[PDB]
Amino acid sequence: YKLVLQDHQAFRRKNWRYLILDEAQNIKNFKSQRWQSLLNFNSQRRLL
DNA sequence: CTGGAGAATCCCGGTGCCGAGGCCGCTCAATTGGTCGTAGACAGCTCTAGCACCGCTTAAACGCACGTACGCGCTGTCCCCCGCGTTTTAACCGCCAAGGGGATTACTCCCTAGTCTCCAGGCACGTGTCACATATATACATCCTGT
């Protein structure tokens, strides 16, 4: 997260098949800049 | 002066993010219509500067000549910033309480301030002198001359 948060420009425009997030508690709230950064990530399937 | 690498740009096509534009709906602020004292414009009148000289005086600008001193280039070499790689660190998070701190809106109200008088005293103007600058008698005062 300390990385994808600010490099989302390169990852957002990608055709991910499975999106996996370990320790999803970092996305506990939608006011933390990660929930937003990771929300619109183009992916087919999502796993928390 | 080329190669020969080697990074750096930099085309160029791609793709969502989000500001730019547009549309809707009221509010308010510019228009309309009309009345009403000024602003200032314009037509004189005055007389103050502004301009235009002219002469005499001489400071000053000026050209020249003539060094010296400062300017520029050169040189040497020697410090202190540049380039770049590593360790450090501060700047971003995210967290976890529970509520206010303060611009913003609004309504009475009421002191303060405009407006508009009439005055009269205090400050622009005319005039009286006094401090500094100016130009001239003067009582000796230094060469010149009869003697």
Swiss-Prot record:
Q: Where does this protein reside within or beyond the cell?
A: Nucleus
Q: Domain of life of the organism in this record?
A: Eukaryota
Function of the protein: Catalytic component of the SRCAP complex which mediates the ATP-dependent exchange of histone H2AZ/H2B dimers for nucleosomal H2A/H2B, leading to transcriptional regulation of selected genes by chromatin remodeling. Acts as a coactivator for CREB-mediated transcription, steroid receptor-mediated transcription, and Notch-mediated transcription.
Q: Provide the disease association from the record.
A: Floating-Harbor syndrome: A rare genetic disorder characterized by proportionate short stature, delayed bone age, delayed speech development, and typical facial features. The face is triangular with deep-set eyes, long eyelashes, bulbous nose, wide columella, short philtrum, and thin lips.
SUBUNIT field: Interacts with CREBBP and EP300. May be part of a complex containing SRCAP, CREBBP, CARM1 and GRIP1. Component of the chromatin-remodeling SRCAP complex composed of at least SRCAP, DMAP1, RUVBL1, RUVBL2, ACTL6A, YEATS4, VPS72, ACTR6 and ZNHIT1. Component of a NuA4-related complex which contains EP400, TRRAP/PAF400, SRCAP, BRD8/SMAP, EPC1, DMAP1/DNMAP1, RUVBL1/TIP49, RUVBL2, actin, ACTL6A/BAF53A, VPS72 and YEATS4/GAS41. (Microbial infection) Interacts with hepatitis C virus (HCV) NS5A.
Question: What family does this chain come from, according to its entry?
Answer: Belongs to the SNF2/RAD54 helicase family. SWR1 subfamily.
Q: What is this protein called?
A: Helicase SRCAP
Organism from which the protein derives = Homo sapiens (Human)
GN (gene name): SRCAP
**Stretch of the intact protein here:** 725 to 772 of 3230
